[PDB]
Amino acid sequence: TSQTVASHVPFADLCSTLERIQKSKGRAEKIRHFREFLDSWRKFHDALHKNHKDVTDSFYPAMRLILPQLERERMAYGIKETMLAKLYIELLNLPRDGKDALKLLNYRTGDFAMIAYFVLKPRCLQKGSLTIQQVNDLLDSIASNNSAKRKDLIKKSLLQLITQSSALEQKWLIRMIIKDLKLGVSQQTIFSVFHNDAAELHNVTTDLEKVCRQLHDPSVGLSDISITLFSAFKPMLAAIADIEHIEKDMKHQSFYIETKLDGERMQMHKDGDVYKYFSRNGYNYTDQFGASPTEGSLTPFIHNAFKADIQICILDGEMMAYNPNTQTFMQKGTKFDIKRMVEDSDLQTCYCVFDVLMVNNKKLGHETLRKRYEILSSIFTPIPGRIEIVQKTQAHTKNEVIDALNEAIDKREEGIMVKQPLSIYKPDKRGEGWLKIKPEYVSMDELDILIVGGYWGKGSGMMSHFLCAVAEKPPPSVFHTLSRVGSGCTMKELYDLGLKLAKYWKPFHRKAPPSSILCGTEKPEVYIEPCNSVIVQIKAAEIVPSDMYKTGCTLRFPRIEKIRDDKEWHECMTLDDLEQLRG
Amino acid sequence: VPQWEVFFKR
Ligand SMILES: Nc1ncnc2c1ncn2[C@@H]1O[C@H](COP(=O)(O)OP(=O)(O)OP(=O)(O)O)[C@@H](O)[C@H]1O
Incomplete structure (x- = not known):
């Protein structure tokens, strides 16, 4: 009994x-x-x-x-x-x-x-x-x-x-x-x-x-x-890989380079009007995201993106906070409160799918990754900023992966993913088919340098890149360019800085350039007078020779870490400093 | 009714 x-x-x-x-x-x-x-x-x-x-x-x-x-x-x-x-x-x-x-x-x-x-x-x-x-x-x-x-x-x-x-x-x-x-x-x-x-x-x-x-x-x-449907499976995992060996590591055959998103690993389980979401550790997040298309922060918005033939599916991806006004995913590390902003509808939840494990009555785990990707395209029609297929492209070059890594760090991503097209899905297994690549950063992480120029581009407009300089040691009135760095508003403070700087930009004229700002071949679209600008803290992998900048060198994989508005413009790093740093 | 004490401590 x-x-x-x-x-x-x-x-x-x-x-x-x-x-x-x-x-x-x-x-x-x-x-x-x-x-x-x-x-x-x-x-x-x-x-x-x-x-x-x-x-x-x-x-x-x-x-x-x-x-x-x-x-x-x-x-x-x-x-x-x-x-x-x-x-x-x-x-x-x-x-x-x-x-x-x-x-x-x-x-x-x-x-x-x-x-x-x-x-x-x-x-x-x-x-x-x-x-x-x-x-x-x-x-x-x-x-x-x-x-x-x-x-x-x-x-x-x-x-x-x-x-x-x-x-x-x-x-x-x-x-x-x-x-x-x-x-x-x-x-x-x-x-x-x-x-x-x-x-x-x-x-x-x-x-x-x-x-x-x-x-x-x-x-x-x-x-x-x-x-199996509605069972939390342990996510497949990416192993760290040094760029030098990649071509070997991908078995000397074609491979995928996919965007590496720093969000929350989340799996979605779908059967009709019934949804379940599991985090990487197997906890249930359905209360937040939505059990049904009438409830939650995601499901009501993605439910109708699934194509007509799709009754059942299982997806793997990352939840990201998307900023509609700048069309940018927000990084986890910010002074700002992401969950609250998502609840306040300043940001929205976006599900970025990179895998599918079951479609209708069909199990996909033991299919080639390539086959899974084909299937993914048939699962739903993407809606930018709510549900998306992570962008990927074919490659076979160590060269092509540095390109990828360079552009990734430039867009303020933190790395790239490399995947074997013939690999199958292996729950909780790390490495095997999937690799992740990040810069070899050297703890050089506290490069504090002045913004002296900017570049317009994608997004709201808002600037896509900054040109940064170091100070010539005065008896500061002259600066030397050092690096372009990605400016994308992945944290609100970079967005707030942009509004702060907006009224100070001036057109840069190659044929009549400013005296306070000395450039290499790399010219900015606009510049800013040094006394009007701000120090940013820059993490870099190394300093390498370059004729694009006046310093005669630049930064490999640079990335703004902090806006150091707690330091006056004249507290800039000097050439003398930079010289000492290279040693 | 089998009793637990004899399955464990034996
Ligand atoms: N496109 C992708 N395909 C597969 N897995 C991914 C992808 N993007 C991210 N991931 C998983 O999410 C993790 C990112 O989590 P997190 O936000 O902690 O990254 P991070 O702190 O920037 O650096 P790291 O990735 O080394 O943890 C990756 O390590 C990887 O396991």
Whole structure:
């Protein structure tokens, strides 16, 4: 009658197993102790359910305490080490000014659980009373009441966990709440011991419960473990690659160079008017983006972009904040508050899709990437700034990838992606088919130089690039150009700077140039008098020889990091400085 | 009804 194994196993039996494992020296011994607990569970299960029919009961109530980091059903506990300290100080009735109280309070980073254990052990002699199931009920209570900001009920659930458990169970309970058990055995090892297929399964369903239920019998595997509709799969990952080796790395055959967006990795699951969104760690973001075309920040706007033949699909991409007025994606690192601006409709959510894993009743994971891309084009018609196919192009040249990387950094992207056209989709696997390339930046990151010129181009107009200079050391009235740098308004402060500078630009005349600003072959469309301009902080990979600038050199992969409006124009970097820097 | 104590501590 709805019976469960967890309802018969003392949490104490779980914690003694954990203790034995943690205290065990070698991998083999650690594994042994786990197999022993597991096997008892499985044999008891068979006994408990021999007569029972169609049972959903499994190792899950234990599994989730053993791998607390993978809990997805329960929301956050919201319990601080310092909050426990206080509860424990009051409850154990410690001298409020004594070493024990203070050691719990002033705890920083011996985990807290151990410090707590050594205070508890002399004082808390009770034998434990709770089943694994009851521990789960109480943890559920904490999470649920956390979500509701019902602090008092939270205390009461905790007080039932503590006063009902032994000292040793509390040490483990604390680790289960912090979600760091410190067993000295990887979660990969845990899955391997549980079932040959546990890890593969977990990668395409970020769900311990399904993993435990479906693989409850060790001696029967699953085949064609695959991405399935409404199951969070772990994203495929890009490995770092040095530019020098790329041609080899892409197997000396054609490859894709795709835009690298720094957003939130999000997967979209679609069946009709029903949508689910999962983040990279397998959390549900459907409340924000929209379950149905009538709800949320995205779904109502993209629902009708899906072509007529499309009833079911699974997409992988990045959520970006798009600025409609400048047609620009906003970078994560800004002084400004992106989520609020998206909620205030100053920015909007844009889904940039680079992959598709299922279309209708058809699984795509084991298709060539090239085939997947073809299919992607058929999935939906893009709407700029809401749902888009990430831009890609074919290439086979190390040369072509530097071009890509140069233009990427120029447009204030932070790198590029390189992908094998024949590669298949491999959940949670890093590298393999996908590489990422970024500049080799050298910590040179604090180049503070003056804006002396600008270039109009794409976007609202607003400027696409700045020309920057260093100061000639005065006995500052003369500057020497050093580099063009991308100006795109990927952060509002660059946009605000533009409005600040607007009234100061002056037409640059090659045949009658200003004296305060000395140029190489690179001339700006407009310039600005130095006393009217602003220092920007520039990150660069290196300084290289160049006749385009007066300094006789320029910056490789430059990028504005900060607007240093906290420094007067005359605080500019000098040639003398730059010379010293090159060494 | 199978009892847990004999499956674990055995
Ligand atoms: N076009 C793309 N195709 C596949 N994956 C991508 C793409 N763009 C971004 N990603 C994933 O998103 C990540 C970017 O996240 P994030 O914003 O942290 O980047 P970052 O901090 O600028 O640098 P890094 O990429 O090294 O983390 C990439 O590392 C990659 O795993």
